[PDB]
Amino acid sequence: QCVNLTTRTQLPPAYTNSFTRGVYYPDKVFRSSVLHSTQDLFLPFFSNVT
Amino acid sequence: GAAAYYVGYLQPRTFLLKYNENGTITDAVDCALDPLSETKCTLKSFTVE
Amino acid sequence: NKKFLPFQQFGRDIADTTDAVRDPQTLEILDITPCSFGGVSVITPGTNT
Ligand SMILES: *[C@@H]1O[C@H](CO)[C@@H](O)[C@H](O)[C@H]1NC(C)=O
Ligand SMILES: *[C@@H]1O[C@H](CO)[C@@H](O)[C@H](O)[C@H]1NC(C)=O
């Protein structure tokens, strides 16, 4: 198709902050009562999410 | 109509985790946010005396 | 006796090794205790005695 949107508004991509979001399990590995820490492709805290 | 959805970008950060008895992630602590978070990741504990 | 989520397979210890597992064929929680207990101690008196 080529029909445009009816009410497409030309709005800028505004910004909010990822507070504690984006905390995933790094693998399929169970832990218990430990304070593990590692590096992987994370969602950075408090950054501009669109 | 009224609908909201947010977009985040994945970056190679470094986090601290805390597991409970049941093994869920209870708390998440960043490393490279401020020198306080750097300190919490350096001591391998988020309870700095 | 832990809470394995169905994707969670490998239990890790504080020493970051393999602790608790699950058979990929049959869903079951297991626990591992390593072998090779300790060493050899020899008690003897004096040979001339
Ligand atoms: C988001 O971007 C704006 C400029 O586009 C900047 O002023 C603001 O500080 C950013 N937010 C954060 C949390 O850094
Ligand atoms: C673990 O799960 C059980 C199931 O109800 C719950 O009673 C218990 O409080 C949980 N423990 C933790 C540390 O989350």
Side-chain angles (χ1 to χ4, degrees), chain A residues 15-17 46-48:
Chain A
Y15 290 154
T16 52
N17 286 321
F46 296 158
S47 66
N48 276 330

Side-chain angles (χ1 to χ4, degrees), chain B residues 20-22, chain C residues 3:
Chain B
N20 55 4
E21 293 179 353
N22 294 323
Chain C
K3 186 186 285 183

